[PDB]
Amino acid sequence: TISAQVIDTIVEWIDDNLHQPLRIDDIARHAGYSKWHLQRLFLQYKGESLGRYIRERKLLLAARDLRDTDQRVYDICLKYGFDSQQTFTRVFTRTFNQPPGAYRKE
DNA sequence: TCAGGTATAGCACTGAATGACAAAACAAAATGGTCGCCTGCGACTAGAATACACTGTGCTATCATCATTAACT
């Protein structure tokens, strides 16, 4: 029990939320937690910044949609959180060091 | 009942993340070049001369409109 069961709610919010980005103001409101409700969790249970963890989660979620043989490549990053194509391209290039088409063909 | 404390939240700050503009590359589409077929036109010089189309609805049941026939005037 950390801050009255915030771990059991963060995962549910991440799984049920839409492609809306997750920031301090967005998440803290109806999350049941303060900025400090989440800082201690991100420091202890995860030990990683939010901008990197959210990007990794989006990449792991899109790894299946890229294999689902979808022709609308521009909408894949949009349906999962990336509001722009260039941001998703840079994130994928810095993470996997591979072009988007090279991983989409696989 | 007043107080030390741990749990929870706001605050100060560099530097990484996230926008906007421009250029290079690939696929879809319209335009143009080229090959083989379809087609329009002309010619083939023994003699061949109105006879081959062919008909067949069948004559019901009346009814009304137009020029030739015969004859009164």
Coordinates of C-alpha atoms (C1' of nucleotides) in Angstrom, one line a residue, chain A residues 1-8 41, chain B residues 8:
Chain A
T1 CA 0.0 0.0 0.0
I2 CA 1.7 3.2 -1.3
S3 CA -0.3 6.4 -1.2
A4 CA -3.5 4.3 -0.8
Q5 CA -3.3 2.0 -3.9
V6 CA -2.1 4.2 -6.7
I7 CA -0.3 1.4 -8.5
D8 CA -3.5 -0.6 -8.9
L41 CA 6.2 5.7 -7.5
Chain B
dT8 C1' 2.0 14.3 1.5

